[PDB]
Amino acid sequence: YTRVVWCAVGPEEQKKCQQWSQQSGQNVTCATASTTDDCIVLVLKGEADALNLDGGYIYTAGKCGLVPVLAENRKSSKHSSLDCVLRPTEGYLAVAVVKKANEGLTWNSLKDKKSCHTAVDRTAGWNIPMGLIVNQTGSCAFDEFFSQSCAPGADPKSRLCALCAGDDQGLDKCVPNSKEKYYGYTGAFRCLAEDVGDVAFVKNDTVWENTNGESTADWAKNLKREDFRLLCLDGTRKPVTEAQSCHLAVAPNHAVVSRSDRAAHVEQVLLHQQALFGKNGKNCPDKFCLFKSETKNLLFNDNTECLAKLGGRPTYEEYLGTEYVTAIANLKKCSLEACAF
Ligand SMILES: *[C@@H]1O[C@H](CO)[C@@H](O[C@@H]2O[C@H](CO)[C@@H](O[C@H]3O[C@H](CO)[C@@H](O[C@@H]4O[C@H](CO)[C@@H](O[C@@H]5O[C@H](CO)[C@@H](O[C@H]6O[C@H](CO)[C@@H](O)[C@H](O)[C@@H]6O)[C@H](O)[C@@H]5O)[C@H](O)[C@@H]4O)[C@H](O)[C@@H]3O)[C@H](O)[C@H]2NC(C)=O)[C@H](O)[C@H]1NC(C)=O
Ligand SMILES: *[C@@H]1O[C@H](CO)[C@@H](O[C@@H]2O[C@H](CO)[C@@H](O[C@H]3O[C@H](CO[C@@H]4O[C@H](CO)[C@@H](O)[C@H](O)[C@@H]4O)[C@@H](O[C@@H]4O[C@H](CO)[C@@H](O)[C@H](O)[C@@H]4O)[C@H](O)[C@@H]3O)[C@H](O)[C@H]2NC(C)=O)[C@H](O)[C@H]1NC(C)=O
Ligand SMILES: *[C@@H]1O[C@H](CO)[C@@H](O[C@@H]2O[C@H](CO)[C@@H](O)[C@H](O)[C@H]2NC(C)=O)[C@H](O)[C@H]1NC(C)=O
Ligand SMILES: [Fe+3]
Ligand SMILES: [Zn+2]
Ligand SMILES: [Zn+2]
């Protein structure tokens, strides 16, 4: 038992982590890096213990020997009497979203159009859709498929960063942290919402949490579901209500990882942390709520009900599942057995 050092990605996560730190009596402390990759490195080194990660990063981290510990769990309909911490995770739907007004734009006419990605190496924003495109075009030149994009994490001076905007001042353009205006699920959807891009690769949930009054953000308060369409892989367009029948894939939930030798320890502390600041926790919303950051998805997704135990002590390949791991492998041949660091 003891203190857990969390790794925050960028200045906004840092500010929230510090709040969490103060409220916890320093039972959790904070380290900060500029990218998710740097955070993986801090954990490897032992300078940080844990962070929450999208599936695409669970993959990077796993080659380097880090393990899944607890997974994000959101509101469910199947598997009903079980307590949240013990309910199995559902996964989320990776979808491609466009404006209704942009008529005649289908999966089969995406070439040379403008795109919005959560960030390079992420599941819904990059791995799935780009894996799909490489496989469909028989080419590895996925950097030449779209005319312009905002793909946080690519080369700032490449076309994959042409549509990114940086921070309030124009700095940090295309950085894969929340300082970049078009970063993450929310940033990518905003990129489409403001007609900077033609299509956004996000998840089912993002469309719903940022339309019809669900978000009071300047850019989203007037957004309406009917104004959006999902691009299905059979060439059709469907309303956002039909995501169960019109998605690119189902993604494994974001999860907390740590070095294997710290797993038990990290797990113990966080379960107690969530009993205090989680969905129905003792001090939320009284003093501090771990799963809220006003639609910004800082440290955790805002729609998380709880962090769930992984039943069955998964390796990272089992957590991701065989379907998703094959996809990432085949796509990374474009740009076997080794840790990136
Ligand atoms: C896309 O992403 C979005 C965003 O994440 C998802 O939208 C969210 O999804 C959740 C659920 O998935 C939404 O529901 C939330 O609000 C509920 C309303 O209070 C909360 O409680 C639930 O209510 C459900 C019904 O609304 C319950 O389900 C059942 O309802 C049946 C009614 O037909 C009922 O049937 C009985 O009673 C009937 C009377 O009408 C009889 O006719 C029948 O005979 C039968 O006896 C069942 O008993 C049962 O109640 C459910 O059990 C819950 O209690 C709850 O808090 C929940 O979270 C959420 O609002 C929504 N978010 C937003 C902002 O839209 C969406 O799901 C995603 N879609 C995909 C494809 O993944
Ligand atoms: C890009 O193209 C790539 C090349 O095609 C894709 O990589 C391919 O991905 C495929 C699907 O993920 C893999 O094919 C699978 O083929 C068999 C079918 O899956 C099985 O289904 C049974 C249910 O009946 C399950 O029980 C079982 O677990 C499998 O999931 C699999 O063969 C099986 O082998 C067992 C014995 O081990 C046998 O008894 C079963 O009958 C069954 O036939 C096989 O293992 C695969 O799962 C391809 O392997 C994979 N190809 C390559 C070259 O990597 C890639 O996904 C494409 N990208 C996208 C985005 O789609
Ligand atoms: C610091 O962590 C410890 C361990 O969970 C907490 O102190 C515990 O308080 C609980 C009551 O919730 C007792 O049952 C345990 O005996 C205590 N453990 C120890 C090791 O003393 C405490 O809640 C945490 N403090 C903060 C700020 O979260
Ligand atoms: Fe994701
Ligand atoms: Zn499906
Ligand atoms: Zn196993």
UniProtKB/Swiss-Prot annotation:
Disulfide bonds join C7-C39, C17-C30, C64-C339, C84-C306, C116-C191, C140-C334, C150-C164, C161-C174, C232-C246, C284-C289. Residues 4-333 form the Transferrin-like domain. It is found in: Secreted; Cytoplasmic granule. Monomer. Found in a complex with LTF, CLU, EPPIN and SEMG1. Found in a complex with MPO and LTF; interacts directly with CP, allows Fe(3+) incorporation into LTF and activation of CP ferroxidase activity. Belongs to the transferrin family. Transferrins are iron binding transport proteins which can bind two Fe(3+) ions in association with the binding of an anion, usually bicarbonate. This is Lactotransferrin. It comes from Bos taurus. The gene is LTF.
